[PDB]
Amino acid sequence: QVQLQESGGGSVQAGGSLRLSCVVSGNTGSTGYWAWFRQGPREGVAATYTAGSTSMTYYADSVKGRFTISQDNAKKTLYLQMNSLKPEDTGMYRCASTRFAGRWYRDSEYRAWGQGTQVTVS
Amino acid sequence: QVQLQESGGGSVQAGGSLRLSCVVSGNTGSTGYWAWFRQGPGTEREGVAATYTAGSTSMTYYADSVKGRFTISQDNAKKTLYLQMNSLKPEDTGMYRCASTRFAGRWYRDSEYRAWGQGTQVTVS
Amino acid sequence: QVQLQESGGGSVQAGGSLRLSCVVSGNTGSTGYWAWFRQGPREGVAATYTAGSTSMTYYADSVKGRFTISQDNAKKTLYLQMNSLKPEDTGMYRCASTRFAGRWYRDSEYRAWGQGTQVTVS
Amino acid sequence: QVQLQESGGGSVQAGGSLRLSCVVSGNTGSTGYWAWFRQREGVAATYTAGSTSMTYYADSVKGRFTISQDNAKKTLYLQMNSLKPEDTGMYRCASTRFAGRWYRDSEYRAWGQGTQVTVS
Ligand SMILES: C[C@]12CCC(=O)C=C1CC[C@@H]1[C@@H]2[C@@H](O)C[C@@]2(C)[C@H]1CC[C@]2(O)C(=O)CO
Ligand SMILES: C[C@]12CCC(=O)C=C1CC[C@@H]1[C@@H]2[C@@H](O)C[C@@]2(C)[C@H]1CC[C@]2(O)C(=O)CO
Ligand SMILES: C[C@]12CCC(=O)C=C1CC[C@@H]1[C@@H]2[C@@H](O)C[C@@]2(C)[C@H]1CC[C@]2(O)C(=O)CO
Numbered sequence: 013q014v015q016l017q018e019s020g021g022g023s024v025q026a027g028g029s030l031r032l033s034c035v036v037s038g039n040t041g042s043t044g045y046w047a048w049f050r051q052g053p054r055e056g057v058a059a060t061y062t063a064g065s066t067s068m069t070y071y072a073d074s075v076k077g078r079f080t081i082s083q084d085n086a087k088k089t090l091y092l093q094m095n096s097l098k099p100e101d102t103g104m105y106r107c108a109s110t111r112f113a114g115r116w117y118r119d120s121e122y123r124a125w126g127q128g129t130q131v132t133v134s
Numbered sequence: 135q136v137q138l139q140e141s142g143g144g145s146v147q148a149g150g151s152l153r154l155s156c157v158v159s160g161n162t163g164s165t166g167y168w169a170w171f172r173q174g175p176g177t178e179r180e181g182v183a184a185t186y187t188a189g190s191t192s193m194t195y196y197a198d199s200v201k202g203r204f205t206i207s208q209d210n211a212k213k214t215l216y217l218q219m220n221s222l223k224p225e226d227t228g229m230y231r232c233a234s235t236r237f238a239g240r241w242y243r244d245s246e247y248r249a250w251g252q253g254t255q256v257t258v259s
Numbered sequence: 260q261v262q263l264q265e266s267g268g269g270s271v272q273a274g275g276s277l278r279l280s281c282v283v284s285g286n287t288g289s290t291g292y293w294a295w296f297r298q299g300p301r302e303g304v305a306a307t308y309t310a311g312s313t314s315m316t317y318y319a320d321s322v323k324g325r326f327t328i329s330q331d332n333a334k335k336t337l338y339l340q341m342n343s344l345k346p347e348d349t350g351m352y353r354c355a356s357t358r359f360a361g362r363w364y365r366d367s368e369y370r371a372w373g374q375g376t377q378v379t380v381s
Numbered sequence: 382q383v384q385l386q387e388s389g390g391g392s393v394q395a396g397g398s399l400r401l402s403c404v405v406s407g408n409t410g411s412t413g414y415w416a417w418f419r420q421r422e423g424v425a426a427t428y429t430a431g432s433t434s435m436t437y438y439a440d441s442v443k444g445r446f447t448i449s450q451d452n453a454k455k456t457l458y459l460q461m462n463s464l465k466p467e468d469t470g471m472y473r474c475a476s477t478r479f480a481g482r483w484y485r486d487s488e489y490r491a492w493g494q495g496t497q498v499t500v501s
């Protein structure tokens with residue numbers, strides 16, 4: 013029922029910036045995890061837990077301080093802002109969501125996935 | 135030399151969302167604080183959120199009153215600072231001004247900031 | 260080269276007032292059109308032509324006498340003062356600029372655009 | 382929305398070769414023009430249709446330059462052979478969803494900063 017669709021990716025030079033988006037539709041309920049994963053040439057990049065009351069955000073150590081996850085709730089859109097891009101950031105960036113997760117960064121805890129948007133860092 | 139220009143302000147219903155932007159130009163140097171302050175008529179400026187950027191990577195700071203509702207981010211290639219607001223409350227109403235400085239002992243001390251934009255108004259009804 | 264930054268929209272009741280602003284930066288040149296368009300999921304609302312020596316102002320018939328366009332050349336800012344707002348004024352209002360245009364309201368001739376500010380009149 | 386970044390330029394002797402690259406990212410849509418300009422003269426462009434492409438060259442570079450694009454890598458190439466001194470310039474890539482004349486720079490909505498080519 014929950015549908016996720018990513019956009020905004022592409023090819024960028026090392027050191028560059030990029031902002032990815034993912035739109036959500038369907039009966040999500042009010043609380044859960046909304047996350048970005050990357051499949052490089054499937055690791056958790058960043059995630060936000062929305063409590064439905066506030067919010068908690070998590071980052072992978074390799075992107076801390078370079079990436080920012082945010083969301084516009086009125087627009088049902090999740091964002092991944094990327095700065096200081098490195099070649100090892102290359103991959104298919106997929107958004108995922110779930111009502112319940114133990115590890116925010118474990119892909120198998122997520123029940124809804126988008127197809128992804130490719131990011132290739134020169 | 136450093137110039138800051140905010141945009142994206144507007145009117146919103148309580149519970150709504152809004153994203154502010156600020157573009158910088160000029161000789162900033164590579165390191166320092168980039169912050170959002172808010173001020174209502176007759177009130178003192180209150181630090182909302184800030185980032186500290188090092189020579190490389192950034193750290194982020196939030197006022198307790200906006201934590202978990204506002205998110206600060208920047209796009210360095212676009213020289214732009216963002217404030218994503220969600221779950222807006224009437225008490226978030228104010229003139230939102232972006233500020234920057236190479237040097238600040240504490241992120242929320244407006245007296246330490248050296249460049250200021252004119253601001254963009256956010257009204258929450 | 261040219262960047263357009265908008266502000267000032269949002270929610271208001273019918274009969275209300277809103278004041279849109281757009282700040283321009285970059286290499287614009289000295290003459291041309293500076294316009295407001297409204298986009299629903301782009302029709303011209305108002306524009307100014309600056310000949311760089313005085314200006315001329317243009318309005319869509321449906322906003323004449325309710326909206327006023329003005330510009331501060333010192334602050335490089337364009338304003339749209341919207342009084343007596345009606346529900347049909349609802350839309351995404353985007354600023355646009357161009358050196359040449361066959362008609363002020365022909366958005367296809369405008370190459371520089373702002374992201375938009377949403378205006379919702381209940 | 383659309384971010385274009387060129388690379389591959391520099392200083393080269395007449396008669397030499399160079400391959401410029403431009404990477405694109407962001408929400409582009411599926412159809413439009415992707416072009417190389419030198420400064421502002423149209424050098425070469427490719428139109429990609431919804432189906433699948435059409436390519437155009439300035440008369441002064443026909444038979445010497447080739448434009449191509451790797452759609453999987455979101456990269457536009459300008460292969461320059463038999464370079465001449467009048468090819469010197471700042472080569473900028475541009476893109477747009479629609480244009481009447483592929484070579485008219487004023488019709489393009491997105492621009493890169495460019496890569497300099499100096500032919501001695
Ligand atoms: C993570 C979440 C719940 C768990 C899930 O499987 C899918 C998602 C992604 C979208 C999130 C959603 C909930 O948190 C409520 C949210 C924030 C929504 C976007 C807008 C929203 O509907 C609200 O803001 C409700 O007020
Ligand atoms: C806080 C800072 C330094 C202190 C100052 O007075 C003004 C600013 C705001 C813009 C920041 C800048 C530096 O950090 C370098 C930054 C990040 C820049 C935006 C893009 C940038 O120029 C770079 O990314 C260069 O690497
Ligand atoms: C429409 C125009 C030229 C065409 C274009 O693509 C972008 C714009 C909007 C900003 C205008 C500009 C020119 O007219 C010169 C202006 C008025 C400028 C704001 C202040 C200005 O720079 C001056 O007043 C210079 O005297």
Ligand SMILES: C[C@]12CCC(=O)C=C1CC[C@@H]1[C@@H]2[C@@H](O)C[C@@]2(C)[C@H]1CC[C@]2(O)C(=O)CO
Binds near residue numbers: 383405412
């Ligand atoms: C010219 C175009 C559309 C108009 C625009 O402002 C930016 C460009 C450059 C990149 C092109 C794009 C579209 O044509 C779809 C393309 C080909 C894309 C490269 C890979 C692509 O996304 C696809 O291959 C879709 O199948």
